Design a protein around this ligand. Structure first.
Ligand SMILES: Nc1ncnc2c1ncn2[C@@H]1O[C@H](COP(=O)(O)OP(=O)(O)O)[C@@H](O)[C@H]1O
Ligand SMILES: Nc1ncnc2c1ncn2[C@@H]1O[C@H](COP(=O)(O)OP(=O)(O)O)[C@@H](O)[C@H]1O
Lengths: 173, 173
């Protein structure tokens, strides 16, 4: 079967990465197109059980995710990676892993402002951060480096459904 | 798609793990079944680039391989893993990763005597070991713990084609 591709999200916690990724996966699976949401939180229980949450370990999580994505893509899947990916350097690294493998890679920026993400707070992570229960939380006490040249910028005026269709349009362009 | 399954080979260098794995992969793909050979040598260049060859790093290589295999199986592939896997603990841990995930796992022992493996010496690794250019070579220096209860035991009186079909018969059982 033909090589797949990778959509690499980036954005603040609660910006919509997983919501968009999951809906794109469903839309594609409804058409019989193999898609797969590769979420680091899932991998940390198994593949990445050796890692903690130091800065180096967060970078290594993303490095490994980039190689798992290239593997799944080479197996024919449309891979959707909803990681925060806060530093430019590790989005560049992840792209280079894909380019070295011959696999199409798209950087998709969920550009929702902090205030809006914090009002969403779907998992209560912002409430924990503000209470001092989580530190080095991207957007609060650790930096988010905004993508300068993303392939697609998703904005909060558009619905999850609309944004999902924009990702599919990108894939098909 | 229905969940896939993993075939985990084990055996000395030159016993036939890769040859059987690769032919099973071809036979299945020619029937339209989604098979994939997951080889740690390939992964060490990317995913597992951080690992060296200490005993602990060899174990961690296999631990990570077992998770990548479960992931690809959960994505619908028939996964073939041709690793030496010399310690019983390696193979038990790998099985338990699959069982915890709900994925069928088969331990296939390529039981070819050391002398016959050395007469094959397909990549010249035995010739290097005997000249003192390689060390910690399983079956010579470093122990190989023979499977006590494999799902299938492949013997060198059969052809690679015959052995491959025995693996498929196990899968279709
Ligand atoms: N485009 C959107 N329109 C409306 N609500 C959205 C939108 N994107 C996300 N949300 C809401 O915001 C929440 C946070 O989004 P989520 O996908 O969990 O973020 P992330 O995965 O980036 O942490 C979701 O629960 C969802 O209810
Ligand atoms: N059943 C067999 N009959 C004859 N030769 C075989 C058989 N199985 C393997 N071989 C030969 O031995 C070599 C085994 O190498 P390989 O499959 O790379 O072993 P491993 O992966 O176990 O190290 C192959 O080159 C192949 O030519």
């Amino acid at each position: 079967p033909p090589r797949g591709k990778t959509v690499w999200f980036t954005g603040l916690s609660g910006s919509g990465k997983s919501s968009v990724a999951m809906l794109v996966e469903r839309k594609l699976l409804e058409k019989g197109i193999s898609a797969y949401v590769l979420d680091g939180d899932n991998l940390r229980h198994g593949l990445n059980a050796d890692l903690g949450f130091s800065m180096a370990d967060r970078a290594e999580n993303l490095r490994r995710l980039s190689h798992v994505a290239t593997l799944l893509a080479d197996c024919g899947h449309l891979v959707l990676v909803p990681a925060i990916s806060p530093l430019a350097e590790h989005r560049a690294l992840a792209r280079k892993v894909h380019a070295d493998a011959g696999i199409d890679f798209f950087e998709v920026f969920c550009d929702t402002p902090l205030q809006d993400c914090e009002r969403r707070d779907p998992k209560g992570l912002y409430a924990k951060a503000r209470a001092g229960e989580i530190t080095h939380f991207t957007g609060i006490d650790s930096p988010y480096q905004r993508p300068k040249n993303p392939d697609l910028r998703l904005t909060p005026d558009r619905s999850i459904d609309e944004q999902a269709q924009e990702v599919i349009d990108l894939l098909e362009s």
